[PDB]
Amino acid sequence: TELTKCKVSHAIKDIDGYQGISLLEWACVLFHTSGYDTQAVVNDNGSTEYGLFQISDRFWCKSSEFPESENICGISCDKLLDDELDDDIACAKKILAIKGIDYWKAYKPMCSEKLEQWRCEKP
């Protein structure tokens, strides 16, 4: 499903401030990462990135095309292609604590200024 900035913002509220990244920065990051599409599937040289957070099967989740992945998140990548974000979030948090925000290449170029526009004002 292609979510709205506000659907996304409400759904990932739990990640706010984690590792020092605000919800505004995330709303920005997720838009350029997946267009807020919970079913986004992208190829990246031999690897595949899944869902809203574009979590890669290279190290983070277990896919059928790469069953020997380290699967640091301990989750099947297909679980990252649905509308239930709790597990996506738990995985994103491990990526943030282990690798850091720079896993998301859009952060620096697209979300270093003009963050206010990313605020969701919808209760």
Binding site: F31, H32, V42, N43, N45, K108, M110, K114, Q117
Partner: protein, 272 residues
Amino acid sequence: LTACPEESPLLVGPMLIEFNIPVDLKLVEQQNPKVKLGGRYTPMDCISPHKVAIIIPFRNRQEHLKYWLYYLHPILQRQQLDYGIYVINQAGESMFNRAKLLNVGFKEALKDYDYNCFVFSDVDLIPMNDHNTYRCFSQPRHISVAMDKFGFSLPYVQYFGGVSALSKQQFLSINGFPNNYWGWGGEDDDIYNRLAFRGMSVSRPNAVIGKCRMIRHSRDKKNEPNPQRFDRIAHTKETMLSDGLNSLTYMVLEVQRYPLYTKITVDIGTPS
């Protein structure tokens, strides 16, 4: 003859834009008798200060083009513009390179007429209000401000994708657009970066006047998300001086003059 009014008296405002009733280019020509070979039109009633080349990046979307032509020709004439339509067809099967095709459109159009304004438009966007003039302004102009694809809203303030217009001078100022973005994404953010570095701001009509409708389509295997897009965008400041109009190379495989447009098929090379 006298100069055309700052605003055309022909404008209709909001329009119903639909993609059902198949269109017949022959009919479109029938309905647009003032448009001359190659898709050129110049007002007979007044003199327009807007000499606009409308550049459309393209690859196997003839069905989208028919609707684009069907809707835009009447709109552009209403807007009283001295314009020409150029479809830049990317030959081959490499990943789509939108920005480079747009650079080709600029150079090629200039061979035909002394245009002073260039409108860059994807084939699948149709404006819903003819007050959204397809011409150039004192600052770079972002035209497709409120597309349905984004819930009739601007997705982010730095967005300069879809349809835009740059005066010849604004284009030259940023050394044109990048040639090194293959596949989907980022090239329009790079352009936005170039404009900002040359000290320009983006001019836009409001979200009501700027509504546009997008003709839907399925993922394009020839235009998969570009993995390097983010690094490229992050370095525009340095690469804009070496990648753009000044470094553009391509081979024209055919120039086609149809009654409703000029289609230039080109070989723009491959990723390197």
